[PDB]
Amino acid sequence: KSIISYNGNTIEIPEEYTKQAPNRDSTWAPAQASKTEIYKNNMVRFEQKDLSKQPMPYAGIELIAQQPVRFVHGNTAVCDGANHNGPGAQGHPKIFINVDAPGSHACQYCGTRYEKEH
Amino acid sequence: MLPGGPVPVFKKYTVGSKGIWEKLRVLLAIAPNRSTGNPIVPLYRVPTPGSRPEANVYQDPSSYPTNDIAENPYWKRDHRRAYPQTAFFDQKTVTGLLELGSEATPRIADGEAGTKALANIANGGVSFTQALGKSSKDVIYGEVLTVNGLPPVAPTLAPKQWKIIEGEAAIYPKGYPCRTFH
Amino acid sequence: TNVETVAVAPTILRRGGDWFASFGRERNSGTKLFCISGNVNEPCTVEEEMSIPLRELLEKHCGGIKGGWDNLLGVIPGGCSVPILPKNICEDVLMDFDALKDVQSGLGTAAVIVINKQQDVIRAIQRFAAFYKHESCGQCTPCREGTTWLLKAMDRFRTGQAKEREIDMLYELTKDIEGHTICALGDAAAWPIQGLIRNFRPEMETRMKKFHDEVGAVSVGGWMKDARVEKGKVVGAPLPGVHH
Ligand code: SF4
Ligand SMILES: [Zn+2]
Numbered sequence A: 001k002s003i004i005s006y007n008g009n010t011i012e013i014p015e016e017y018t019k020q021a022p023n024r025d026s027t028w029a030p031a032q033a034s035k036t037e038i039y040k041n042n043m044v045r046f047e048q049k050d051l052s053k054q055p056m057p058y059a060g061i062e063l064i065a066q067q068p069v070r071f072v073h074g075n076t077a078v079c080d081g082a083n084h085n086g087p088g089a090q091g092h093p094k095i096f097i098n099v100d101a102p103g104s105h106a107c108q109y110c111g112t113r114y115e116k117e118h
Numbered sequence B: 001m002l003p004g005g006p007v008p009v010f011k012k013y014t015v016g017s018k019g020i021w022e023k024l025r026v027l028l029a030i031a032p033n034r035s036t037g038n039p040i041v042p043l044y045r046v047p048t049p050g051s052r053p054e055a056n057v058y059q060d061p062s063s064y065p066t067n068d069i070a071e072n073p074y075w076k077r078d079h080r081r082a083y084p085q086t087a088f089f090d091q092k093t094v095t096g097l098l099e100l101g102s103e104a105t106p107r108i109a110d111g112e113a114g115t116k117a118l119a120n121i122a123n124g125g126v127s128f129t130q131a132l133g134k135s136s137k138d139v140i141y142g143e144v145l146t147v148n149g150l151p152p153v154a155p156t157l158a159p160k161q162w163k164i165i166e167g168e169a170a171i172y173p174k175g176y177p178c179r180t181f182h
Numbered sequence C: 001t002n003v004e005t006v007a008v009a010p011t012i013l014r015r016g017g018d019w020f021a022s023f024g025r026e027r028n029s030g031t032k033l034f035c036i037s038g039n040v041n042e043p044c045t046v047e048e049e050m051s052i053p054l055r056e057l058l059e060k061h062c063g064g065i066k067g068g069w070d071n072l073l074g075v076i077p078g079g080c081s082v083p084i085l086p087k088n089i090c091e092d093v094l095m096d097f098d099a100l101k102d103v104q105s106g107l108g109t110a111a112v113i114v115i116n117k118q119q120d121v122i123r124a125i126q127r128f129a130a131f132y133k134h135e136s137c138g139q140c141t142p143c144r145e146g147t148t149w150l151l152k153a154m155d156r157f158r159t160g161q162a163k164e165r166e167i168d169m170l171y172e173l174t175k176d177i178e179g180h181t182i183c184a185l186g187d188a189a190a191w192p193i194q195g196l197i198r199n200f201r202p203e204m205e206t207r208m209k210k211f212h213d214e215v216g217a218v219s220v221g222g223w224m225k226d227a228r229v230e231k232g233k234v235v236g237a238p239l240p241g242v243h244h
Helices: A035-045 B020-028 B091-099 B112-122 B128-133 B137-143 C003-007 C009-015 C018-022 C054-059 C097-102 C121-135 C141-157 C165-175 C185-199 C201-214
Strands: A002-004 A010-012 A076-079 A095-098 A113-115 C031-038 C045-049 C072-076 C111-116
Touching: A002 A035, A010 A035, B091 B112, B091 B128, B091 B137, C003 C009, C031 C054, C054 C111, C121 C141, C121 C185, C121 C201, C141 C165, C141 C185, C141 C201, C165 C185, C165 C201, C185 C201
Parallel strands: C031 C111
Antiparallel strands: A002 A010, A076 A095, C031 C045, C072 C111
8 A cells, every 4th residue: 555645755555554453454433543544644663664563463343243143032131251161250240131122232341242032 | 495496307398418418418517407498399389379279169258247148237337437536625625624524423503504604615704724723622633633643644555564584485595685575 | 098998988877886886896896898718618708897806707607728727827817918827826816907916917908818738838929029020110119129139039939049048138128128118019018028937937948958959059149059151041050930
């Protein structure tokens, strides 16, 4: 990608590093700065540096859309992101989701979805 | 021996010598009791803290009357909102205790008469020196000083009667310029 | 007013009043329809003077108890809004407001509900709690919530899924309701469980021991040791009452 600097020059950056994350291009929030506006404002400190080795973790908004929906019999689904493998809580506070309404419903802490069997 | 040593080597948990080298060490040691100080690898810090079995059975500890679920109201074990007030006593509030008395030893007239008697002192009606001179012997010797007439001493909450240990129990022998108090 | 309270009145006025005072004890005068029901030989509806003994009412105007007077576990003399009575106190207790009040009960609509020993009294009380849950108007906090807690507890005590100290917890839960409501339905939702606890405690404890032997150990709240939230549901333990 070729990003135009403010001072009239250009900023060449390869495509693998303009993506907001290795699994998603676009931003997932209105106030999020896109990588192009980042570079365009901060190339003085990116110039001789290697972009392969900079931190580029995966996004969760796309890895949680992949997770299959869960189902239940009733107007409630209980969630507690508990490991069940090691001791202690290790999860998030118990949350009872209402699932009577036609669509899926997600926990507010984790994005796991629940539905009323249909 | 005393309750504080000396103790041998085979009860100290240190890495020592073995064989002829032990005989040589006990020969060439100022005090053969003493240890190298290197801990014993099989024991010290084993099992490692990140592999203790006891963490799976662990549960948050508690005490009975506070973990009781039925007759355990908080307003009985709320010790913070029961905090003792900071009392304040200016000369006015002290002369009233002198000219008058106290709930334990009243000397006050009944009715609105005694009420205005309190009121005369609430304002500058009678002074502290005036009621110090108007105080009979039973007042002072029994409410300011002691019954014996002596003044009170700086009180101690938790008194300490000291005692000296000398000779064999003492931390240091007699010659040294330090001693030992119980 | 109650229907009967005005329905009688023309006759009390026509006929002089004093004879009505001649019925019953000093402050509990007159006649009172009694709707008997339950495990009685002959369920009936009858009219009698107040201060009549409970035992004559059970034996004469009806067919006595089904199975004999000593096949009696308890009796409820005012409907569900009144604590149950034990057999010891049904031997000589008059059916008036005062004496029933003197045994920590009361006369309601004078509807007697009888219960033999072949019955699960705990099933009767949890049913009354499910009723009051269904009839709470949903306005004031203690009835909205306390009734559902009481149901969730009584459904567990029915199978033993509890500890013994949960009964004293339950007594406190009723005291969380007994005076903090608007209407009287909150007190009426409390009292029968106070009467069960006061009298028939060992049956509760015995069902609990029966659970501890037949299923497994239990903690506060009906959580066992293998209980877990797996995939939106609790799986490691039975769940009493859930039907939805
Ligand atoms: S106690 Fe009475 S007023 Fe309050 S919520 Fe229950 S039914 Fe309604
Ligand atoms: Zn969740």
